[PDB]
């Protein structure tokens, strides 16, 4: 007695799968490859992407105050007129903001 596994499963490696949001890929002069993270304005060598397993059986309008614009050179970027600041990252790709901890001067109850 037993039964065989009915499992169907797809594996897609990192690099068959698109970059996470806010990231961009680039090359050095020497054609070496590296990555830019516009969510925090950093760069590293280490590809952010992760492999994907998946079982098989059983755009939009810019937020208020934001502008999409293009330099003389033809590069695309984003503008916050309510802040007078600029970014490489489409505002629409942002996740919700970090909600700061409650204030030190606030009303609270003690547990430990
Ligand atoms: Ca661009
Ligand atoms: Ca760029």
Numbering used by the authors: 140 to 197, 214 to 267
What's the paper's own text on this?
WW domains organize molecular assemblies by binding to short, proline rich peptide motifs each with ~4–6 residues. The type I WW domains bind to a consensus ‘PPxY’ motif (where P is proline, x is any amino acid and Y is tyrosine, also known as PY-motif) with very modest affinities (with Kd in the range of a few to a few tens of µM). To achieve this goal, we determined the high resolustion structures of 7 representative WW tandem/target complexes, and measured the binding constants of >100 WW domain tandems or isolated WW domains binding to known or previously unknown targets. In this study, we discovered that WW tandems, but not individual WW domains, can bind to target proteins with extremely high affinity and with very high sequence specificity.
We were able to obtain high diffraction quality crystals when the Dendrin PY23 sequence was fused to either the N- or C-termini of the YAP WW tandem. We solved the structures of these two versions of the complex. Thus, the two WW domains of YAP do not form a supramodule due to very limited inter-domain contact. This is supported by the two versions of the complex structures solved, in which the inter-domain orientations are obviously different. Second, the Dendrin PY23 binds to the YAP WW tandem in a parallel orientation (i.e. PY2 binds to WW1 and PY3 binds to WW2), instead of the antiparallel binding orientation observed for the KIBRA/MAGI2 WW tandems.
